[PDB]
Amino acid sequence: QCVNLITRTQSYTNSFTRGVYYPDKVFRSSVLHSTQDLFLPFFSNVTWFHAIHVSRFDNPALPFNDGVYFASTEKSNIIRGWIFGTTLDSKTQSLLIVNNATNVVIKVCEFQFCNDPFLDVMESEFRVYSSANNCTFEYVSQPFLMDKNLREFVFKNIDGYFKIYSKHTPINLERDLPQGFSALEPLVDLPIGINITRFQTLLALHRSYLSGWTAGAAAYYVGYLQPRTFLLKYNENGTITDAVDCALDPLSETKCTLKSFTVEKGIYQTSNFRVQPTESIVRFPNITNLCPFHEVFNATTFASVYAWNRKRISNCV
Amino acid sequence: ADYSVIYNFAPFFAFKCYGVSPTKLNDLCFTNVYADSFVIRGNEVSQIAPGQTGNIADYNYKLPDDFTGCVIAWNSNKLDSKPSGNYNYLYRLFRKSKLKPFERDISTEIYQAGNKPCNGVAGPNCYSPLQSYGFRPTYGVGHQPYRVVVLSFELLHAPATVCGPKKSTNLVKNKCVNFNFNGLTGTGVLTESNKKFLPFQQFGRDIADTTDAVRDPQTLEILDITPCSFGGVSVITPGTNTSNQVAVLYQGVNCTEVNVFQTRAGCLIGAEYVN
Amino acid sequence: QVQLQESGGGLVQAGGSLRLSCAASGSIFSPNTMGWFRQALGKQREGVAFISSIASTSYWLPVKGRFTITRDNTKNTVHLQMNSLIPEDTAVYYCYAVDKSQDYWGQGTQVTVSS
Ligand SMILES: *[C@@H]1O[C@H](CO)[C@@H](O)[C@H](O)[C@H]1NC(C)=O
Ligand SMILES: *[C@@H]1O[C@H](CO)[C@@H](O)[C@H](O)[C@H]1NC(C)=O
């Protein structure tokens, strides 16, 4: 019963100072630690998606690339699930994450996901995927969508290990991506060890019971992660209160070089500028004649080792 | 994977391990394990082995030549023998081709041993591939039923997650001892710590990139690790022609951790302080 | 845990008819093959007839016409139709569910004929 229901519109906005998380499991206090990792750059293109269902296919699957940063100011009931995979069919293994009030279930099975998957509220998962076979992982734990408040998640897939970090930050009348800082604590670590290249966000729909699904609008934000060097300031209680992007602007480059958040008056040497080549060219000889390696390599008789035979090869390809 | 309960389950006719020693199973961590359970006659127990031939090996259960794991067999007369005959155990006697390693066949098609087709109905030159294991309590030891479990341990690119229990030992403190915490090996004194770890963080590092705090796995406690005392030994002595008496100075060491005097330079032994 | 419900046995005179039925509830995984076995009084256990999941039938005794197997895909059940009943088939019957991993067994039905 895969039914196309949602029309999706996109806008562009600045990421501001979001996309940070704890990169490892090491406590640090009152230090400045610089690390190279997949991150969301400061002041970048973030894309705001608005998905509307009114009581055709208009929700293409967004590629995973190197990772995904998801943000949502909606309440926990509206947004409920995530769908991860490469082809999103029964041929390849797939990730399905479903959240309810009671708990959260993450299941790795060969789901046959629909073109427009959604959860219809009991709660039915059959709308999400037609079938699931060869299932190899089930995990149930406390929900991470509790009830004005931005919920931020970041998903990474490195060396066959899949990482989910999340955080809940209250937000005022300011834009849903406000200023300030908020570190994303790590929540879920799963040794899945499969391939993921595309992802899709599930939406909760309530049956109208009177146009069988009530109209609804969901607003969320997608950002992408790339390999960047970040300098983070762990505080007295091991909390990332501030961070700088080492390749944003020259001032941040000097801060990166000096390993400090304050720079005194002066002239500092940071890096070396060089211009990259535009394209590659190859120049080779004009001869087209092949070369008789077969004569040597299929000759009927060879000579003795003390009377070994040599042949000079030249002017061939 | 607690192999101790496997060892102590019951006396075993065979506990033969191929590619791995039985003792090192606990300390080796495998990516995946496969438990293959079946019941066979005592004579066919030896047929469950790499490079072996037989009805069970060719048509029922085949192991690869490079198989890594173990085979465990034990008698089950009380469970798998009845006076009237336990006909609930079946084996494949006839098959067109030999079974590949780690392959199963559930087809019940009549074996065709003749040119004339069997037409799906039993008849001349057509025999049922599956035969019943008529186990009886009075059978000879070779023919008595035996339960056989084959453990196949495989390692893949995925991280290993199956191995034996991790010992807890005990906790001691205020003594320079050798510590091993989750693969972090070293020596130090594990004193009480005023620091407050985040639940995710297990270790703690100094400014100069060295471990100074650690979290106990058994009990969620935080311990400050301090390296054991060390110093330089200096010898204070007059000329050997003048005398042969010497004094020893441990630099930077408190006098209680070794005519004893305590100075800012260290602990002095063998010299008398005067005003 | 799989329960194999057996029904349809009893006392029938020579030349009568009956309908054995085995319903497999529980695990009964998808690539199942269902069969019937015969247990004569104080004798060995032979195979009555087996039906597969692709409707292929393999009768293990020269008995065609006597047993006929009917399949119910909606409930995954198997029915054995008995006709022209003769005294030499007087034996208890169990149905055999191979499933894919662990095969199962029935409880038993008394089938009797005499005159
Ligand atoms: C964001 O990307 C879009 C298309 O990818 C582009 O048109 C736009 O200029 C970008 N935004 C900024 C601030 O560069
Ligand atoms: C062929 O290659 C030779 C040198 O290898 C060069 O002199 C000549 O110009 C080439 N011919 C063409 C048509 O480029």
Residue numbers in the entry:
A (entry chain B): 14 to 68, 75 to 140, 149 to 174, 183 to 245, 252 to 358
B (entry chain A): 359 to 616, 637 to 653
C (entry chain L): 1 to 115
What did the publication describing this PDB structure actually write?
Antibody treatments target the spike protein on the virus surface, which is crucial for the virus to enter cells by binding to the ACE2 receptor on the cell surface and then fusing the viral and cellular membranes. Derived from an alpaca immunized with the prototypic SARS-CoV-2 spike, Nanosota-3 has demonstrated high potency against both the prototypic SARS-CoV-2 variant and an early Omicron subvariant BA.1, both in vitro and in mouse models. However, it is ineffective against a more recent Omicron subvariant XBB.1.5. In this study, we adapted Nanosota-3 to the XBB.1.5 subvariant using a novel structure-guided in vitro evolution approach.
To understand the structural basis for Nanosota-3C’s potent inhibition of XBB.1.5, we determined the cryo-EM structure of the XBB.1.5 spike ectodomain in complex with Nanosota-3C at 3.19Å resolution. Our previous research had shown that the RBD of the SARS-CoV-2 spike adopts two conformations: a standing-up position to facilitate receptor binding and a lying-down position to evade the immune system. Nanosota-3C, like Nanosota-3A, binds to the RBD in both conformations. Among the three copies of the XBB.1.5 RBD, two are in the standing-up conformation, and the third is in the lying-down conformation. Nanosota-3C binds to all three copies of the RBD. Compared to the structure of prototypic spike with Nanosota-3A, both XBB.1.5 spike and Nanosota-3C showed significant conformational shifts in the loop regions where mutations are present. However, in the interface between the XBB.1.5 RBD and Nanosota-3C, these interactions were replaced by a π-hydroxyl hydrogen bond between Trp60 of the nanobody and Ser490 of the RBD, and an aromatic π-π stacking interaction between Trp60 and Phe50 of the nanobody. Thus, the mutations in Nanosota-3C align precisely with the mutations in the XBB.1.5 RBD, enabling high-affinity binding between Nanosota-3C and the XBB.1.5 RBD. The results showed that Nanosota-3C binds strongly to both the BA.1 and XBB.1.5 RBDs, with Kds of 27.3 nM and 2.04 nM, respectively. The results showed that Nanosota-3C-Fc effectively neutralized both BA.1 and XBB.1.5 pseudoviruses, with IC50 values of 33 ng/ml and 16 ng/ml, respectively.
